[PDB]
């Protein structure tokens, strides 16, 4: 007697509109190394062609 009756539909909210923008992807953590590197390097050295 789990039977459905035709009562009025009041308070009909709508939400969760399926817009593609709502999608975001897993924050797959990548921890190959720590970010400790800081050096200035010789990457500011000069040598150029013709």
């Amino acid at each position: 007697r789990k039977q459905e009756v035709p009562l009025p539909a009041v308070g009909v909210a709508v939400t969760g509109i399926p817009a593609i923008e709502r999608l975001r992807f897993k924050e797959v953590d990548d921890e190959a190394e720590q970010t400790l590197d800081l050096s200035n390097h010789a990457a500011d050295l000069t040598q150029i062609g013709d």
């Binding site: 590197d37 800081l38 050096s39 200035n40 390097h41 990457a43 500011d44």
Partner: protein
């Protein structure tokens, strides 16, 4: 020409330093110093200037 150089350092913040780090092609840490009396910049097309 030279008068405004006196205005530089006296009246206004004159830029002589820039440090970058893993920005664009500047891998590691770079840095170049502006000259407080006018400075040029030069390099081939697509070298990190812009």
């Amino acid at each position: 020409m030279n008068q405004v150089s006196g205005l530089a350092g006296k009246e206004s913040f004159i830029l002589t330093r820039i440090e970058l780090f893993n920005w664009g092609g500047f891998h590691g840490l770079h840095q170049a110093a502006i000259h407080q009396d006018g400075t040029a910049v030069i390099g081939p097309t697509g070298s990190g200037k812009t």
